[PDB]
A paper describes a structure:
The enzyme 15-prostaglandin dehydrogenase (15-PGDH) is a key negative regulator of tissue stem cell activity in proliferation and in the repair of tissue injury, whose negative regulation of tissue regeneration is conserved across multiple organs. 15-PGDH acts via its NAD+-dependent enzymatic activity of oxidizing and degrading prostaglandin E2 (PGE2), and related eicosanoids, which provide key trophic support for stem cells in multiple tissues. 15-PGDH assembled as a homodimer, which is the proposed physiological form of the enzyme.
To gain insight into the molecular details of 15-PGDH inhibition, we used cryo-EM and single-particle analysis to solve the structure of the human 15-PGDH protein bound to (+)-SW209415, a second-generation 15-PGDH inhibitor, plus the NADH cofactor. Despite the relatively small size of the monomeric protein (29 kDa), image and post-processing yielded a cryo-EM map for the 15-PGDH-SW209415-NADH complex at a nominal resolution of 2.4 Å. Following asymmetric refinement, the cryo-EM structure exhibits strong density for (+)-SW209415 in a well-defined binding pocket in each of the 15-PGDH protomers. Strikingly, (+)-SW209415 is buried within the 15-PGDH protein with molecular contacts formed on all sides of the inhibitor. Additionally, the (+)-SW209415 thiazole contributes to binding through π-stacking interactions with Y217 and hydrophobic interactions with L139 of 15-PGDH. Finally, while not as well resolved in the cryo-EM density, the butyl chain of (+)-SW209415 occupies a hydrophobic pocket that is surrounded by I190, L191, and I194 of 15-PGDH. Thus, the MD simulations recapitulate the cryo-EM findings that the lid becomes disordered in the absence of inhibitor binding.
Residue numbers in the entry:
A (entry chain A), B (entry chain B): 1 to 256
Write the structure that this text describes.
């Protein structure tokens, strides 16, 4: 289908949701490039995947997504190695309200820069044969959170940018589809950032609320988030859609 | 009431909506500091206002909101001159998709930096007697726009940050209220930015759509937007609310 024999570039694939994405894509029969700033974690992940699939179907590149030149050298290294780019996934993110400027830079700016860098290669006008770009958001992009003000700001921006760029691409005859995912609580190391003042700052005194709400709702395993990505990729007529994943309902879509 | 004898700091007050805000506040009996990066326009505005009100109620400081140190030096210059800060309005903004990074920096980052600088002075925990912070957004912060992708991203983030910070302030016992305004098309020079590829880039070929939309939706006078800010200020029990101004309906509130 639209997965076999296709090249995918995934950001933040050393651990967690990105690693699950890469595993699913490799299982479906694709060639994957893994981008992360943590070298040891990425190398260990590649070694782990090399025990299941063939080594060539995988590549690892170290890069900080905030630095634009690194991303541009990363996109060019991938294309010169495989031959074409067909799937892009922008998933890297952090949580830090003390250093709220770096969080905004990583979460929001890098997504837009990657989206643009990807349209520069995948577009019909520039010689491409189309493809699909997916940007990762959170339920914090649709509801407010008292203890994560700057983090909420970034997810909302991601949602708006994705929705606008979908229509823009439809107008330009680019052959590219754009969609976003909005998951709930996921069992990853990021949750541990809640319990440390270095990441929370003046909001640490109110972490018990988030702890209680996690106890209420529950946590979702990283593999279930990946199936949603695969579902997005194989559907041809999905552009500008927002996916919500919840433990109570499942995979559903926001309505406007 | 809560307007007389109070100090207000307004950003982007040289021309347009900010100037209307300043005029309304001065008419109601307040002392106003005008912040803009255009020196000539600000000086001319201050001279124009000096012909109506007393000079001692008007202060003009020329600062770029993006540079944090300038913003910190402006806030301290304002307090050391008057004596206290009671109202803050973050209204400065631009529209440029070609240089989409500077637009994001000006529209979103500066708003958060100013809100935080303002809470550092207005909060009871730090010796203050409270006050009100207002951040300017657009209807593009609630609906997508094909030709203004990065601009749409900046307004959504503003809305999310304001909604979260309102609850955060309610929890901390700060005595500060936070709300935002989401106007429609307003008769200002910013509209002229649509007709220039310098400000639009690859999206210039699709400006005719906005042109028809501007004509159909009509236009709103800046003093009418100023009547909304005053309404927000005099209402004590409004925190975390979003105002929408339209030519068909009027002044109304988003519901969640
Ligand atoms: N886990 C959760 O509860 C939720 C997470 N998300 C989002 O999911 C995405 C993935 O995060 P998780 O896997 O949950 O967390 P994680 O912390 O386990 O993984 C994030 C990955 O991003 C990488 N990364 C961070 N900044 C980077 C940078 N500047 N350059 C390159 N790589 C960078 C890290 O090395 C790490 O491998 C993030 O955007 C996060 O905000 C959204 C919904 C909820
Ligand atoms: N006019 C409209 O149709 C709408 C405008 N808005 C928003 O209203 C706000 C006010 O803009 P308008 O009065 O309409 O436009 P305008 O272009 O007439 O005025 C903007 C003002 O901001 C100042 N400014 C811009 N960047 C600055 C910076 N970095 N530092 C200091 N001053 C800076 C400019 O000198 C100017 O005086 C903006 O945030 C805009 O996005 C929202 C709804 C629609
Ligand atoms: C850095 C920490 C990463 C986790 S956040 O993006 C995140 S995910 C999430 N999911 C939910 C769910 N609601 C219903 C089913 S699941 C809720 C929250 C959340 C936490 N605090 C609030 C006010 N909210 C809305 C959050 C929340 N704050
Ligand atoms: C830099 C130009 C500044 C004007 S933008 O923030 C702005 S204000 C506005 N207002 C409206 C109104 N809708 C109903 C009554 S008024 C519509 C738009 C707009 C323009 N293009 C679209 C798709 N939209 C939604 C816009 C729009 N794009």
């Amino acid at each position: 289908h639209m997965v076999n024999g296709k090249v995918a570039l995934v950001t933040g694939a050393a651990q967690g949701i990105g690693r699950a994405f890469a595993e699913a894509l490799l299982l479906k029969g694709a060639k994957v490039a893994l981008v992360d700033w943590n070298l040891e974690a990425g190398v260990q992940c590649k070694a782990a995947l090399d025990e299941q699939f063939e080594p060539q179907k995988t590549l690892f590149i170290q890069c900080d997504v905030a630095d634009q030149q690194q991303l541009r050298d990363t996109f060019r290294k991938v294309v010169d190695h495989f031959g074409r780019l067909d799937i892009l996934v922008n998933n890297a993110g952090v949580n830090n309200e003390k250093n709220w400027e770096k969080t905004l830079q990583i979460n929001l700016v890098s997504v837009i820069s990657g989206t643009y860098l990807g349209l520069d290669y995948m577009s019909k006008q520039n010689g491409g044969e189309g493809g699909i770009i997916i940007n990762m958001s959170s339920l914090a992009g649709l509801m407010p959170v008292a203890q994560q003000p700057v983090y909420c700001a970034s997810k909302h921006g991601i949602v708006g940018f994705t929705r606008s760029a979908a229509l823009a691409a439809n107008l330009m005859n680019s052959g590219v589809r754009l969609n976003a995912i909005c998951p709930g609580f996921v069992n990853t190391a990021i949750l541990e950032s809640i319990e440390k003042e270095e990441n929370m700052g003046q909001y640490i005194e109110y972490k018990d609320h988030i702890k209680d709400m996690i106890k209420y709702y529950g946590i979702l395993d990283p593999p279930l988030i990946a199936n949603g990505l695969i579902t997005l990729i194989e559907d041809d007529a999905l552009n500008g859609a927002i996916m919500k994943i919840t433990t109570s309902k499942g995979i559903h879509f926001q309505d406007y």
